[PDB]
């Protein structure tokens, strides 16, 4: 039948592949071994997944009620997309922009859309790494700074802000962030954040100074360190106070939450971050090896290890959460017992955890109208366990105090923050490789122009544009950017990739070329997933997100000391002009298709 | 042992006198600049 719709004689031909594979032409980077490539892909995936994104959503939507839809959507969608991304590379032998421009060169818009999305993600990232390394610097001391409040100028009592709230919230919101009451209001450059951000950008640029040839070495410990630390956290996080207390809470589902589809809305987005899809990324990783590699085995092992790591991090996070909740419940019960004992002057050792209600009843029966002066508070497990933190508080606020309660706090603090830094660094490597590569691929750079110069220029430009996050309103801007970055651009990019593969080029020619390249023709599962399962299932969730974009409210918690009920969340909606900002991400991808069509129609004649 | 009207007030700590975070940042940045210098020297040594 020859199902070629007039797109051949311009793509790198199959005979061209035979000619290039038998003489190993130079002037192209190549991995030293399949392990150095397996490991860097693994590190990129785990870095994009398990920092600030997966545990936060896991503990925000309830846990368990989010893990199940995430797992099913991952096993249904990520594996086909990952296999397709890994096999479209290693065949056209080019970067993402080059790969997507080789076939049907009319649009070429998805490549630049992925470029812009990766640039934005790296822009809002590497500020998380700056905060992580700043929290790491203040370690290496027995009296950890967030463990105690600072004394006021009176030298008698604590500061009002540090007294109405916890010391950890004060050390985060005030000592480190120096957050502002308002959103538009700004402040100084906050030189601590400038120094930390400069250090982060410098270490990133040094690590990938010459690109792949360095990063392959750099990941050798960077993509493996957050696997030997995390495991030991388990052996500490289980058998201290919350063994089968938070884990049991995670294991039991929540039927009520699954009824609300909002969780599903995020779950799909998570896999896009979990498998590092919709970016340039793995394509440049994929089209750097020989033409005799088994892509299916690579995809399956990557997916299996990703799922295992997700289960691991969920277990550890909920273990720590359960331990903290148990400690808070115990201290509240002790406070209640102390209040009763002081009220009625009973012997100290007479009332306990279990004989509290009967003694309380006896006390009110004995001497009524004097017990009524006592203010009793109620505390029960599943009220502290259901409490969810917003923003980036999961660690900076929860894990920090949980560590302080532990015996040898500085050691686990420093190792935890080192893990987090390594995960963030692997992530940043991954979305950094998807930058500059399109820039050097579109081929307008002057000839000599060594790659180090371009990497330095792009790093300094990104530093200059990310200067904004070091202000006093940086946290609000980062939250605003994250509220719209990701999701819709990634969904659009996935739809464009799926459409281009299924309609342009062709599934049949794909089967022929994968059979010739390594053999092992894909079985019916892959064909049915690419045919109607994955594209329709992603399109329906895209439409659902578009529908619910109209009804979710738009606000954010703020830190205003000058306001009643201060240790509570305040919502003040959004300014009238900030909406304009999100428009910059509205219609990026499909701008160039009509332009190219107009050029073709009016340029020939 | 509380006296219900007399509370302690003299508890001022002064443990860190030098802000250890600054020295940690300084040594980290020194190592970073040393590494970037040797890396660029090796890269330009491609004679
Ligand atoms: C299971 O999930 C539901 C989904 O929200 C939880 O519901 C929230 O419970 C709190 C306290 O009872 C209320 O303030 C909210 O109104 C509830 N959400 C809804 C649907 O409005 C429920 O508590 C969870 N139970 C668990 C953790 O097992
Ligand atoms: C302690 O004693 C008070 C009495 O003030 C209890 O309250 C009253 O209980 C009767 C039921 O017989 C109710 O009709 C009243 O409305 C209650 N309030 C009053 C009279 O002010 C109270 O319940 C006891 N405290 C506890 C353990 O709740
Ligand atoms: C850093 C900004 C948001 N905060 C978080 O993501 C913290 O949650 C995590 C993430 C990874 C790992 Br491993 C653990 C143990 C916890
Ligand atoms: C930073 O925090 C201090 C108090 O710790 C405060 O006086 C200062 O005003 C804050 N910086 C700015 C620009 O407001
Ligand atoms: C503890 O409570 C019981 C019953 O109220 C009573 O004997 C007394 O208040 C306490 N027991 C002793 C031995 O003091």
Distance between CA atoms of residues A277 and A570, nearest Å: 36
**Would you say A529 and A80 are in contact if contact means Cβ atoms under 8 Å apart?**
yes
The three-state (H, E, C) secondary structure of A370-433, written as one string: CHHHCCCCCCCCCCCCCCCCCCCHHHHHHHHHHHHHCCCHHHHHHHHHHHHHHHHHHHHHHHHH
Residues 6+ apart with CB under 8 A from A293: A34, A90, A518
Q: How was this structure determined?
A: cryo-EM
Distance between CA atoms of residues A245 and A238, nearest Å: 9
Q: How many CA atoms lie within 13 A of A157 on its CB side?
A: 7
- Determine whether B32 is exposed, middle or buried from the number of CB atoms within 10 Å of its CB (0-12, 13-18, 19+): middle
**Tokens 């030991």 belong to residue:** A232
Q: What are phi and psi of A360, to 5 degrees?
A: -65, -45
Q: Which residues in chain B are closer than 8 Å to A151, comparing Cβ atoms?
A: 12
Distance between CA atoms of residues B9 and A156, nearest Å: 5
Alpha helices in A434-553 (DSSP H): 437-441, 451-466, 474-484, 488-501, 507-517, 524-528, 534-548
The three-state (H, E, C) secondary structure of A150-193, written as one string: CECCCCCCECHHHHHCCHHHHHHHHHHCCCCCCCCCCCCCCHHH
- Determine whether A495 is exposed, middle or buried from the number of CB atoms within 10 Å of its CB (0-12, 13-18, 19+): middle
Residue contact B33–A138, C-beta within 8 A: no
- Take residue A99 and report the two structure tokens written for it: 């790969």
Distance between CA atoms of residues A297 and A302, nearest Å: 8
User: What is the distance in angstroms between the CA of the first residue and the CA of the last residue of chain B?
Assistant: 79
CB neighbourhood size of A141 (10 A): 13
CB neighbourhood size of A543 (10 A): 11
Residues 6+ apart with CB under 8 A from A484: A582, A585
Q: How many CA atoms lie within 13 A of A356 on its CB side?
A: 14
**Tokens 């896991």 belong to residue:** A58
Among candidate residues A273, A278, A284, the one with its CA nearest the CA of residue A436: A284
CB neighbourhood size of A241 (10 A): 18
Nearest CA, atom 3, ligand 5: A350
- Take residue A324 and report the two structure tokens written for it: 């903290």
For residue A249, the ligand closest to its alpha carbon is 1
Q: What are phi and psi of A158, to 5 degrees?
A: -75, 170
Length of chain B: 47
| A-B contacts at Cβ under 8 angstroms | 45
- What DSSP line would sit under A236-300, residue for residue? HHSSSS-TTTHHHHHHS--HHHHHSTHHHHHHHHHHHHHTTTTSSTHHHHHTTS-S---HHHHHH
Distance between CA atoms of residues A406 and A403, nearest Å: 5
Site to probe by mutation for ligand 3, drawn from A43, A56, A237 as the one with most ligand atoms within 8 Å of Cβ, is: A56
- Determine whether A43 is exposed, middle or buried from the number of CB atoms within 10 Å of its CB (0-12, 13-18, 19+): buried
Q: Check if A254 has its Cβ closer than 6 Å to any atom of ligand 1.
A: yes
DSSP A435: T
- Take residue A109 and report the two structure tokens written for it: 């818009």
- What DSSP line would sit under A16-40, residue for residue? HHHHHHTTT-SSS---SSHHHHHHH
Site to probe by mutation for ligand 5, drawn from A347, A350, A360 as the one with most ligand atoms within 8 Å of Cβ, is: A350
Q: Write out the E strands in B1-47.
A: none
Distance between CA atoms of residues A10 and A12, nearest Å: 6
- Determine whether A366 is exposed, middle or buried from the number of CB atoms within 10 Å of its CB (0-12, 13-18, 19+): exposed
Residues 6+ apart with CB under 8 A from A89: A99, A282, A283, A284, A285, A286, A287
CB neighbourhood size of A412 (10 A): 21
Which of A137, A140, A209 has the CB atom closest to B39's CB atom? A209
- Take residue A294 and report the two structure tokens written for it: 């088994």
Local structure of A557: helix, strand or coil = strand
- For the CA atoms of A87, A274, A119, A539, the dihedral, rounded to the nearest 10 degrees, stands at 70
Which of A137, A157, A209 has the CB atom closest to B21's CB atom? A137
**Would you say A479 and A52 are in contact if contact means Cβ atoms under 8 Å apart?**
no
Which of B16, B25, B39 has the CB atom closest to A195's CB atom? B25
Distance between CA atoms of residues A57 and A263, nearest Å: 9
> In Å, what is the CA distance from A20 to each residue of A12, A89, A286?
10, 15, 17
Residues 6+ apart with CB under 8 A from A549: none
Q: If residue A234 lies in a helix (H) or strand (E), which one and from where to where?
A: helix A225-237
Distance between CA atoms of residues A285 and A430, nearest Å: 9
Residue contact A137–B32, C-beta within 8 A: no
B21 in contact with A at a CB cutoff of 8 Å? yes
């Amino acid at each position: 039948v020859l199902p070629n719709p007039g797109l051949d004689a311009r793509i790198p031909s199959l005979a061209e592949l035979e000619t290039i594979e038998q003489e190993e032409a130079s002037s192209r980077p190549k991995w030293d071994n399949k392990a150095q490539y397996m490991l860097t892909c693994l590190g990129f995936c785990v870095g994009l997944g398990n920092v600030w994104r997966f545990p936060y959503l896991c503990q925000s939507h309830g846990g368990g009620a989010f893990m199940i839809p995430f797992l099913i959507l991952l096993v249904l969608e990520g594996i086909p997309l990952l296999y397709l991304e890994f096999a479209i590379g290693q065949r056209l032998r080019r970067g993402s922009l080059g790969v997507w421009s080789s076939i049907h060169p009319a649009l070429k818009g998805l490549g630049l859309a992925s470029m812009l999305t990766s640039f934005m993600v790296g822009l809002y990232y590497n500020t998380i790494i700056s905060w992580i390394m700043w929290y790491l610097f203040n370690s290496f001391q027995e009296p950890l700074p967030w463990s105690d409040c600072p004394l006021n100028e009176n030298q008698t009592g604590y500061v009002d802000e540090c007294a109405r709230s916890s010391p950890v919230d004060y050390f985060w919101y005030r000592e480190t962030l120096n957050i502002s009451t308002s959103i538009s209001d700004s402040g100084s450059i906050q030189w601590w954040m400038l120094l930390c951000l400069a250090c982060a950008w410098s270490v990133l640029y040094m690590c990938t100074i010459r690109g792949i040839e360095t990063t392959g070495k750099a990941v050798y410990i960077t993509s493996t360190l957050p696997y030997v630390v995390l495991t030991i956290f388990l052996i500490r996080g289980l058998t201290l106070k919350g063994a089968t207390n938070g884990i049991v809470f995670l294991f039991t589902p929540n039927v009520t939450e699954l009824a609300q589809p909002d969780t599903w809305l995020d779950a799909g987005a998570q896999v896009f971050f979990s498998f590092s899809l919709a970016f340039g990324g793995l394509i440049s990783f994929s089209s750097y090896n020989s033409v005799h590699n088994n892509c299916e085995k690579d995809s399956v092992i990557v997916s299996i290890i990703n799922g295992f790591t997700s289960v691991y991090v969920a277990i550890v996070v909920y273990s720590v959460i359960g331990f903290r909740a148990t400690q808070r419940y115990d201290d509240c019960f002790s406070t209640n017992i102390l209040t009763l004992i002081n009220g009625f002057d009973l012997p100290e050792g007479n009332v306990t955890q279990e004989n509290f209600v009967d003694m309380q009843q006896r006390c009110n029966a004995s001497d009524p109208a004097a017990y009524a002066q006592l203010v009793f508070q109620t505390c029960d497990i599943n009220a502290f366990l259901s409490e969810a933190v917003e923003g980036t508080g999961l660690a900076f606020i929860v894990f920090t105090e949980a560590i302080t309660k532990m015996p040898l706090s500085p050691l686990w603090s420093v190792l935890f923050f080192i893990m987090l830094f390594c995960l963030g660094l692997s992530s940043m490597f991954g979305n950094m490789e998807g930058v500059v590569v399109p820039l050097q691929d579109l081929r307008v750079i002057p000839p000599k122009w060594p790659k180090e110069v371009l990497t330095g220029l792009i790093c300094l430009g990104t530093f200059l544009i990310g200067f904004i996050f070091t202000l006093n309103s940086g946290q609000y801007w980062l939250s605003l950017l994250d509220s719209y970055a990701g999701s819709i651009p990634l969904l659009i990019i996935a739809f464009c990739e799926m459409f281009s593969v299924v309609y342009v080029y062709g599934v049949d020619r794909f089967n022929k070329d994968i059979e010739f390249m390594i053999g092992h023709k894909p079985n019916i599962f892959w064909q049915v997933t690419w045919r109607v399962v994955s594209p329709l299932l992603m399109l329906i969730i895209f439409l659902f997100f578009f529908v619910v974009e109209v009804s979710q409210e738009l606000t954010y918690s703020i830190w205003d000391p000058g306001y009643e009920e201060f240790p509570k969340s305040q919502k003040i909606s959004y300014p009238n002009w900030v909406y304009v900002v999100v428009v910059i991400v509205a219609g990026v991808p499909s701008l160039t298709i009509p332009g190219y069509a107009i050029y073709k129609l009016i340029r020939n004649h | 042992l509380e006296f219900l009207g007399i509370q302690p007030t003299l508890g001022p700590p002064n443990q860190p006198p030098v802000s250890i975070w600054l020295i940690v940042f300084g040594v980290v940045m020194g190592v970073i600049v040393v590494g970037i210098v040797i890396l660029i020297f090796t890269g330009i040594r491609d004679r």
